[PDB]
């Protein structure tokens, strides 16, 4: 397995550039068995696991999951698309979201 720290050195924050997490995710292989870790300061950001449509429109309500205490560690147990957004303020709207596609171990 591999434990990915989302955003690397920038961690999970409000990006200056909307494509920042698209860039971070590019080229990486997310496999069943891998872990994602979102590091952030309590109350400044959070993590919501959401559907594709909620990702696309930054819909914060009624997510699949929602975590407010950092660090958020999520195991990738199934293959297919996974979407994450931060629901604090305008962060999602400016790019604080991540889309990945999990493949077999």
Residues belonging to the binding site are: 45, 86, 91, 96
* By CB under 5 A, residue 25 contacts Cu ion: no
| Residue 70: other Cβ atoms inside 10 A | 19
Taking CB under 5 A as the criterion, the residue among 22, 67, 88, 94 binding Cu ion is 88
Contact 88, 44 (CB under 8 A): yes
Q: Which stretch binds Cu ion (CB under 5 A): 19-27, 59-67, 77-85, 94-102?
A: 94-102
Return the number of the residue (54 or 102) whose C-beta is nearest Cu ion: 54
For residue 26, whether the previous peptide bond is cis, meaning omega lies within 30 degrees of 0, is: no
């Amino acid at each position: 397995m591999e434990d990915y720290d989302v955003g690397g050195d920038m961690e999970w924050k409000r990006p200056s550039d909307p494509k920042f997490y698209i860039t971070w995710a590019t080229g990486k292989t997310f496999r069943v068995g891998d872990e994602l870790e979102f590091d952030f300061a309590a109350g400044m950001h959070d993590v919501a696991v959401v559907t594709k449509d909620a990702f696309d429109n930054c819909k914060k309500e009624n997510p699949i999951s929602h975590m407010t205490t950092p660090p958020v560690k999520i195991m990738l147990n199934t293959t297919g698309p996974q979407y994450y957004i931060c629901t604090v303020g305008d962060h999602c709207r400016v790019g604080q979201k991540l889309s990945i596609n999990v493949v077999g171990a």
